[PDB]
Amino acid sequence: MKFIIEALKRVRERRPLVHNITNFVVMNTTANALLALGASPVMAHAEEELEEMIRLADAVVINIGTLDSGWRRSMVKATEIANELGKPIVLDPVGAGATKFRTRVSLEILSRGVDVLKGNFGEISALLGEEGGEEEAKKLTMNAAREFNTTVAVTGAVDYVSDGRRTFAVYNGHELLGRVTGTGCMVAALTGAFVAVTEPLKATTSALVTFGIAAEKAYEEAKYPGSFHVKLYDWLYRINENVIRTYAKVREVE
Amino acid sequence: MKFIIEALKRVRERRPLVHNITNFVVMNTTANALLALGASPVMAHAEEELEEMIRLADAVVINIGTLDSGWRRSMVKATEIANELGKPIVLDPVGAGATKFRTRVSLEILSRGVDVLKGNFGEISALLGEEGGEEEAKKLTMNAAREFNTTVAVTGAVDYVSDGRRTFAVYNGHELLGRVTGTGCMVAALTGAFVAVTEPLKATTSALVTFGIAAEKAYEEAKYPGSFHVKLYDWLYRINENVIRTYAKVREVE
Amino acid sequence: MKFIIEALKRVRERRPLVHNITNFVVMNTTANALLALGASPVMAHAEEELEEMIRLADAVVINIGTLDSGWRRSMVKATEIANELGKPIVLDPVGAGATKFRTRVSLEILSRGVDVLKGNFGEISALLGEEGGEEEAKKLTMNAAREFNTTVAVTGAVDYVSDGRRTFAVYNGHELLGRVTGTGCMVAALTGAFVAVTEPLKATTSALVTFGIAAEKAYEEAKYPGSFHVKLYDWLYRINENVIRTYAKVREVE
C-alpha cells in the first residue's frame, strides 16, 4: 500500500525521537527495534525530567508491562504533558484484563487521551468492557476506537486497525513471534516512530505491515526463537520499497 | 532419564504461566528462555497486583539479583501469597554471601518457605552457614535441603539436586555459560515451568538437564559468547525426546 | 600500541569485578560485554548493600541513562564510598545537556570526583559549558579533563582521550554502532574493567581501541543491526594480541 512505503521513507528521512516510558523486559529490545527502523529511542521516566524530555521528543510511547505506583505517576503525568504539547501518544496496555491495576491505569491514561491504543483481543476487549475472531475482532477495533476517540489496533493472526470511520486488515506476520517476548511492544514502539510523521490510522497500519513483513523475512532465515529474534532487527533495517511491494498483505475493510 | 522427557512434554502441553519477580539484568533473557522452552512468562512486582498475578500464575520465581527495599517488600509479600495459595516458589539467591542484605532477604524468604532453592556453591554455603567439590557439593545440597525443608540445587561443573532424601547429579552443561550473564537465573526461571507440572526434585533436575543439554548443543553451533547466547534459546526450543535420550548425563546418587 | 595489548592481557588474567549502577536499557548488554572481554560484572544499587558491594568491586561504573531520584541517591552515595576506598570510578553522563536533571546529577558526581568521564561531544560540551569536529573535539577533551581534574574521552568518528597533559586519538570503530543502543555505555563498562588494572588515560584508550576493533570485526561478519550486535560480544571475546597489532588505529596527539 502506497502510504506505507511513503511513511517508512519519512521515518528514515526525519529520524524522529521516540520517548518511551516502558517496561523492564523490553527496554533494550524496543530501543534496538527503533534504531533498526531508522528512528531514535530515549527511555526516561523521572518526573524531574519528563517535561524536558517530552518537549525534546516527537512522540511518546507508554507501555505498562511492569508498572508500579511510581511508574504510574510518571505515565499519567507524561500523558498530560504530551497532550498539552500536542505530541502523539501510543499506549500499549500490556496485561489489561489480567489485573485490575493494569486495567485501571490503562483507562486512566485513555481518559486523558492517546493517539493510538494497541493491544491484543483480550486486552482491548477488557478495556472496552470495563469502560462500559475476524468479524468479532473487527467490530471490537471499531467500537473501541469510537469509545476512546482514538485509533485502535487489535493485534492477532490478522490485525485490525481503525479510527472509527476507516478500518484496515493486516495479514503479515509469523507465528514464531509468539516465542519472542514483547513483540507487540516492539510494534507499539515502532508505531511511535510512524505516528511522528503520519496520521494515527496510517501510522499504526504501517507499523504492523512493516513489522509483520520483518517477521516473515526473519523466519525465512531463522526457524528458531533465538536466531529469529536477532533477524527481526536485521529486517527492520533492510526492509525497503521493493520488499514492501512484494510482501505486503494489507487491505482496507468495509 | 524418563521423568525428564515426560516433564518436558508436560511443560509444552500445559504451557504453564510462570510469574517472575526478578532482576533487571535478566528480565528479557529469562522471559525468552521460558517462551523457547514452551512456557509463558509474566514479570510483575507491584504490590497493587501481586495477589491477582500470583492467582493467575502456576508458579512463582523470585530472583534477588538487583533487589532494593521496594522489591524486597514485593518478594516477601509474593512468597506469603504464593504459599497461601499453594503456588510453587523457586528462589534464586543471587549474590547471597556477597552482601548481608542479600543473605538476609534470602533467609527471610526461606523462613516463610519455598519449593526450590537454586544457587551456586558460595551462595548456598553462605545461606546454610548464616542460618546455623563433588562430595562436598553433594553434602551441602543435602544439608541445605533438610535445613530449609525444600529441594535444593547447588549448581556447578556437576550439579547436585536433593530434597533431603534423594539426590541427583547432573553432568550436562558447558563452560562457555560462564561468559553469558544470568545463566543460572535462566535455570531458575525454567525450573519455575517444570515445578508447575511435576514435583520439585524431578522438576529442578529436569531443568538442569534440559538447560545443560541446550548449552552443549549451542556450543556445537557457536563457539563465542554472543552467538552462543543466541543458540541457547534455539535449543531450549529444539530439544526433544531424542536429544534428551542421546545427550542426557544424569544419575541418582547414593 | 603496546600498553593496549598489555592492558587487555591484565584484564583477562586478573578478571576484575566491575560494579555497575547503570540504566535499564543496558543492564544485560553491558554485563555480557564485560563477561566477553574477560571481566566480571555485578549490577547493584540498593543503599543497603552499596558499601559491601563497592568494597568487593575493583571499579565502579555509573551510568545515568534512566535515572530518577532514587537512583541518583545511590549513584552519589556510591561515588562517595568509592572515593573513600580508592576504587576507580567511570561516569557515563548519558543525556547530559538534554535535560537539566541529567546535567545537574552529572556535575554533582563530577564535583565529588571520578577517574574517567566518557561521553559524546554534546554531553561533554554541555557539562563543560554549564560548569563554567577533530580540532574542536580535541580541545574539548583537554579542557574538560583539566576542568574536572580527571581523564576525559569525547567519543565520535574519531575518539579523543586526555588526562589534561597527554592526549590520544582513536580511529577504530564502525558507523553501524549507531544502530545498536547503548554502545557508548558498553565502552564505559569496559573502561571499568581496564581502569581496574591500569591508569585512567591508558585504560580508557585501551577500551576504545578494543571496542572499536570489535566493531570493525563484527561488521565484517554481520552487515545488519541484529546480527552485528551479537558479533560485538563474539569479538570482545576473540580479540587478542594479533588482532590488536593488525587492526589498531591509535596515535598520541601533540
Curated annotation (Swiss-Prot), chains A, B, C:
Assigned keywords, A-Z: ATP-binding, Kinase, Magnesium, Metal-binding, Nucleotide-binding, Thiamine biosynthesis, Transferase
Function: Catalyzes the phosphorylation of the hydroxyl group of 4-methyl-5-beta-hydroxyethylthiazole (THZ).
GO MF term set: ATP binding; hydroxyethylthiazole kinase activity; magnesium ion binding
Native organism: Pyrococcus horikoshii (strain ATCC 700860 / DSM 12428 / JCM 9974 / NBRC 100139 / OT-3)
InterPro entries membership: Hyethyz_kinase (IPR000417), Ribokinase-like (IPR029056)
Associated pathway: Cofactor biosynthesis; thiamine diphosphate biosynthesis; 4-methyl-5-(2-phosphoethyl)-thiazole from 5-(2-hydroxyethyl)-4-methylthiazole: step 1/1
Protein's UniProt name: Hydroxyethylthiazole kinase
Uppermost EC category: transferase
GO biological process, one term: thiamine biosynthetic process
Cofactor(s) this protein requires: Mg(2+)
Binding annotation for substrate: 43, 182
